[PDB]
Amino acid sequence: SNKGVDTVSVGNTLYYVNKQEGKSLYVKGEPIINFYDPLVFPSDEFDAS
Amino acid sequence: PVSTYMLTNSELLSLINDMPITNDQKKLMSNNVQIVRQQSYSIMSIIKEEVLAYVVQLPLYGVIDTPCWKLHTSPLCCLTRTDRGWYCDNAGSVSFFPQAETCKVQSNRVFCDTMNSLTLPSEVNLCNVDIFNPKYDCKIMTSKTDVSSSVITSLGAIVSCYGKTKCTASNKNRGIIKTFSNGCDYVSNKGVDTVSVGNTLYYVNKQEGKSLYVKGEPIINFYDPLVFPSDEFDAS
Amino acid sequence: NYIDKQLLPIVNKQSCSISNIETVIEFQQKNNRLLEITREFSVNAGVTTPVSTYMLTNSELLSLINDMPITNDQKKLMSNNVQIVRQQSYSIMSIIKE
Amino acid sequence: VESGGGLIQPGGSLRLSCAVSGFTVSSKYMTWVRQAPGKGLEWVSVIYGGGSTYYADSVVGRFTISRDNSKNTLYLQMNSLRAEDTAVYYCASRLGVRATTGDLDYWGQGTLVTVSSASTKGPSVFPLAPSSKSTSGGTAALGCLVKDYFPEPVTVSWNSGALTSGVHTFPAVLQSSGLYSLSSVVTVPSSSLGTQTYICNVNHKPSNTKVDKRVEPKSC
Amino acid sequence: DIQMTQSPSTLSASVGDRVTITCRASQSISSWLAWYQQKPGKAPKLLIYDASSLESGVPSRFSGSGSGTEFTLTISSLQPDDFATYYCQQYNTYSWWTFGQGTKVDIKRTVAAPSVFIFPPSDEQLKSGTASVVCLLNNFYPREAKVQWKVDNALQSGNSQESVTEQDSKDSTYSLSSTLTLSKADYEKHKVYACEVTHQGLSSPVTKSFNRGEC
Amino acid sequence: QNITEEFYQSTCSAVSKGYLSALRTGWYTSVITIELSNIKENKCNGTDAKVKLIKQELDKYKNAVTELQLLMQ
Amino acid sequence: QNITEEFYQSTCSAVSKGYLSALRTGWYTSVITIELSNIKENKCNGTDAKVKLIKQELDKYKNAVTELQLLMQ
């Protein structure tokens, strides 16, 4: 049964009765930030002079 | 297979050093990653908007460095062996993979899937020498009339020339270099590049073709900086 | 001094962003064929079937077909089932350099 | 680098800890090698990147290898220690990358684990006064005798690590009284027997004693 | 499981020599044998891995060869850098790593004689009921040196213990420190304490002496 | 050269000797995860207001993800 | 759990009982069509006159479509 037994060897060849759980991998990504720069003209100082 | 997007080579080797196998298995997979991919799977497991999770599924090999062999057969006049395919030595016995799909070859190293393989005694090797091997009932395909054909093997070909048919083997430089009398002849892929059997032409060696080239020239990005003449202006 | 020290630095920063952009686009565009190939080799691990219209165009297939050592009757048969000839061909990546 | 070794009575328990710096522990296999007095190297336990753990026959079931991603340190819980487990325990891993499994090229310092009933005694440090003569090699010699301690180890440096040339710190010898004893000397120019400052620093952490005794020529 | 066995127990060779250590396997381990350097009191140093590939940054004077069951470690031009204990390691599978038992290495070199010093028991120690007189043999070769104590010119035997440091990393000489343990009752009963050092590099037996109440 | 061929006229067949093998007898799994480097819409106007690249490019994804989220059951 | 296994030593075989089935006995076809949201070249000059993204991006398509029109016969 695949409950009790996880492996069966027959001579020199190894059979795997149950799948072998493995390492867990992770690929992390950080949010990308859009930036711009608004251009403001000093009109008030200009409209007085 | 498991794409280079699903599993990079760093990560595959990362998973290989974690498999419960022997240094001799770990080293064989590192040197045939092409085949290991073609034999692996990738099943999409948990897909959320901000995170995707899939399950890779690599193959594990039971036995390694076994001696293997592959059988091609041709009519004999009429006999035709029908145990064609890959044979490998399992523990004590011999595993036999009959479909050409489930067995991958690279270089000199075969990778077979045992999911549907047959297990035979080592005495089937005695069938190649004698059809009536008394230690095994060789499955054969019979026929009450003359047949003629060829079958292109790994390193050559087999010519079943029987009856009034007219079979030959040409070479690229020398043209026809051998006519075939009624019998079973075997031709090497060194000397012969073609074998004609009647009105059908077999190709013992792959035919080199025109070489194609697609040329590309570097693309030049150009811009134009806009410069103001302040000095003439800061004077006026 | 606003035009020259403030606003021309930004117009030029933009004329540079747009060349980078226009180039990254024009790169996905001239090597469009290559990028497909290099994609489908990644997805099949180096051997793909069938021979996609990216690996071998129709122009190139007739160039190769007129060179096969075969008879005009095979040459004409392959010309009329190019769909099947693709489904029966392969593509194996041999020498991949940077 | 390790810590947490030392003496514990048979049947007691001890906890090793392997501080690793330079790389993440959660991506490489980590190992434990122990070395008996005057014997060879013996592999003990291993944890692979994916949690598979294996222990040699001698210790299986009694030891427990584990790691914690947080403190980036693999441990080695040693339960039910007998006399034969007494050795020096090294931890190791492989910095570089390949796909074979077994070689090592980062090894920790090495921590001693002693299993014995005997109590702990701090050392008695006495100065070895240089001889009344000034010949015998062109220079003269002075030193320190680290006597009557248990158990190992004791470290002896000179001038807080400054005086290094000509120094010889000898391995201890188990005296009949069950205690250890070693000597530490330094060859110094006899033109500065009373000119240069010579301070031997005896450090024996199993008993929490740190003694500084100065070696100057004798009154006579 | 596998076991590894080397030869010999200890191998002696001079500077610049060609040294060959062997390591044999009870099963064919393919190509997975690693060599290690352990200078006394230190951590093992990786020289060779996978039978033949040399770890990047270790001197190229080390070399390995072989595969299967017969492996060999060969040094082309020996150095004072290298005098230490060498270990081989099999790693044929994941589950079961086993080491060699070790090959300990010493030297041959130009003979150098010991600098003999005698040390009187400190005043801090005689007030405890036991006095320890120390005799020092600093920087000599070969390793074999002989130390004997004389109390009023009477040879002691068995109330002293010797200790010999390992071969030095630079000049490659040994040291020797013998300590004479006596009780305070036995120490002040006699006057002449001395240790006679006979050595290959000495023209004749050399004696360093002191007096009790004097110095 | 390792690989060879043997030819038997008795059976008129050819063997191909000289292969080393690997027989798959099981599976080894691994759970690979990956995260989305998510983009935040940048609020302000472009040359053409009727064009919201950042929004459309997310709905292209979101909607792709959705079509896969319907395949698991 | 519905599915179970029986093992027969008589034949040295094992059955896996407890499966419900769907046996395909024919085909159902459907003709899906889709249209191209076509771009009209916008006439004016860009930062670099030697760069016509819109035209090349169409010829990238057009020519792809053409290469498919050559596979049907």
DSSP string, E4-55: EEEE-SEEEEETT--EEEEEEESS--TT-EEEEEE-TTS--EEEEETTTEEP
Residues 5-24 of F with CB under 8 A from B: 5-24
The answer to whether B45 contacts chain D (CB < 8 Å) is no
CB neighbourhood size of C66 (10 A): 11
Task: In whole angstroms, give the CA distance from residue E36 to residue D104.
Answer: 9
- Contacts of residue E165 in chain D, CB cutoff 8 Å? 168-171
What does the block give as tokens for B9? 């080579």
The answer to whether F46 contacts chain B (CB < 8 Å) is no
- Contacts of residue C42 in chain B, CB cutoff 8 Å? 3-5
Task: In whole angstroms, give the CA distance from residue F3 to residue D24.
Answer: 45
For residue D35, CA distances in Å to D41, D42, D87, D181, D184 come to 5, 6, 5, 22, 25
Distance from the Cα of B109 to chain C's closest Cα (Å) equals 18
Query: What is the distance in angstroms between the CA of the first residue and the CA of the last residue of chain C?
Result: 48
What does the block give as tokens for B36? 């290991």
Burial of D83 per CB tally in 10 Å (0-12, 13-18, 19+): exposed
Task: In whole angstroms, give the CA distance from residue C14 to residue G58.
Answer: 26
Strands (E), chain C: 47-48, 91-92
What does the block give as tokens for C44? 């099949």
Q: Residue E115: which of E134, E133, E138, E135 has the closest Cα?
A: E138
> Cβ neighbours of residue E156 under 8 Å, at least 6 residues apart?
E148, E149, E150, E180
Q: Residue A17: which of A28, A3, A29, A30 has the closest Cα?
A: A3
- Contacts of residue A36 in chain F, CB cutoff 8 Å? 42, 44
Q: Residue D183: which of D144, D150, D154, D156 has the closest Cα?
A: D144
Given an 8 Å threshold on Cβ–Cβ distance, is D49 in contact with A23?
Answer: yes
Tokens 């004609």, residue located: B196
The answer to whether D49 contacts chain A (CB < 8 Å) is yes
Backbone φ and ψ of F16, nearest 5° = -125, 95
Task: In whole angstroms, give the CA distance from residue E40 to residue D170.
Answer: 12
Residue in chain F nearest A26 by alpha carbon: F33
Residues 190-229 of B with CB under 8 A from G: 221-224
Question: Residue E136: beta bridge partners?
Answer: E117, E177
Task: In whole angstroms, give the CA distance from residue D55 to residue D66.
Answer: 12
CB neighbourhood size of D60 (10 A): 10
Q: Residue D173: which of D208, D200, D148, D204 has the closest Cα?
A: D148
Angle at E16 between CA E15 and CA E21, to 5 degrees: 90
In total, chain A counts a number of residues equal to 49
* Single-letter residue type at B225: P
Task: In whole angstroms, give the CA distance from residue B59 to residue B21.
Answer: 11
The answer to whether C74 contacts chain G (CB < 8 Å) is no
Task: In whole angstroms, give the CA distance from residue A39 to residue B109.
Answer: 67
Q: Which DSSP symbol is given to A34?
A: P
Antiparallel, parallel or unpaired: β F13-35 and B109-113: parallel
CB neighbourhood size of A19 (10 A): 14
Distance from the Cα of F52 to chain A's closest Cα (Å) equals 14
In Å, the largest CA–CA distance within chain D is: 70
- Contacts of residue C26 in chain G, CB cutoff 8 Å? 51, 53, 56
Hey, which chains touch G, using 3+ CB pairs under 8 Å? Answer: B, C
Query: What is the distance in angstroms between the CA of the first residue and the CA of the last residue of chain G?
Result: 52
Query: What is the distance in angstroms between the CA of the first residue and the CA of the last residue of chain A?
Result: 94
Mutate to test the interface with D, among B9, B16, B17, B31 (most CBs of D within 10 A): B17
Q: Residue B16: which of B59, B69, B46, B50 has the closest Cα?
A: B59
Angle between the N-to-C axes of helices C72-79 and C58-65, in degrees from 0 to 180, rounded to the nearest 10: 170
Looking from the CA of F59 toward its CB, the CA atoms found within 13 Å total: 5
Data resolution in angstroms: 4.1
Strands (E), chain B: 41-48, 51-73, 80-81, 85-88, 94-97, 103-106, 109-113, 118-120, 140-141, 149-153, 156-161, 167-171, 175-179, 183-188, 194-197, 200-203
* Single-letter residue type at C54: Y
Task: In whole angstroms, give the CA distance from residue D150 to residue D205.
Answer: 10
Task: In whole angstroms, give the CA distance from residue E66 to residue E88.
Answer: 13
Task: In whole angstroms, give the CA distance from residue F24 to residue B70.
Answer: 18
Task: In whole angstroms, give the CA distance from residue D199 to residue D218.
Answer: 15
Task: In whole angstroms, give the CA distance from residue B40 to residue B53.
Answer: 17
Looking from the CA of G65 toward its CB, the CA atoms found within 13 Å total: 8
The answer to whether D199 contacts chain E (CB < 8 Å) is no
Q: Helices H, strands E: what count in chain D?
A: 0, 18
Question: CB of E15 within 8 A of CB of E106?
Answer: no
What does the block give as tokens for E113? 């004689």
> Cβ neighbours of residue C81 under 8 Å, at least 6 residues apart?
G73
- Contacts of residue E210 in chain D, CB cutoff 8 Å? 131-132
The answer to whether D50 contacts chain A (CB < 8 Å) is yes
Which H/E stretch holds residue G15? Answer: strand G13-17
Question: CB of D203 within 8 A of CB of E198?
Answer: no
The answer to whether B110 contacts chain F (CB < 8 Å) is yes
* Single-letter residue type at D205: K
The answer to whether A8 contacts chain F (CB < 8 Å) is no
DSSP string, B98-159: -STTSEEEETTEEEEE-TT-EEE-GGGGGTTT-TT-TTS---EE--SS---EEEEETTEEEE
Strands (E), chain E: 4-7, 10-14, 19-25, 33-38, 45-49, 53-54, 62-67, 70-75, 85-90, 98-99, 103-108, 115-119, 130-140, 146-151, 160-161, 174-183, 192-198, 206-211
| Way the structure was solved | X-ray
Given an 8 Å threshold on Cβ–Cβ distance, is C2 in contact with A39?
Answer: no
Distance from the Cα of B221 to chain G's closest Cα (Å) equals 9
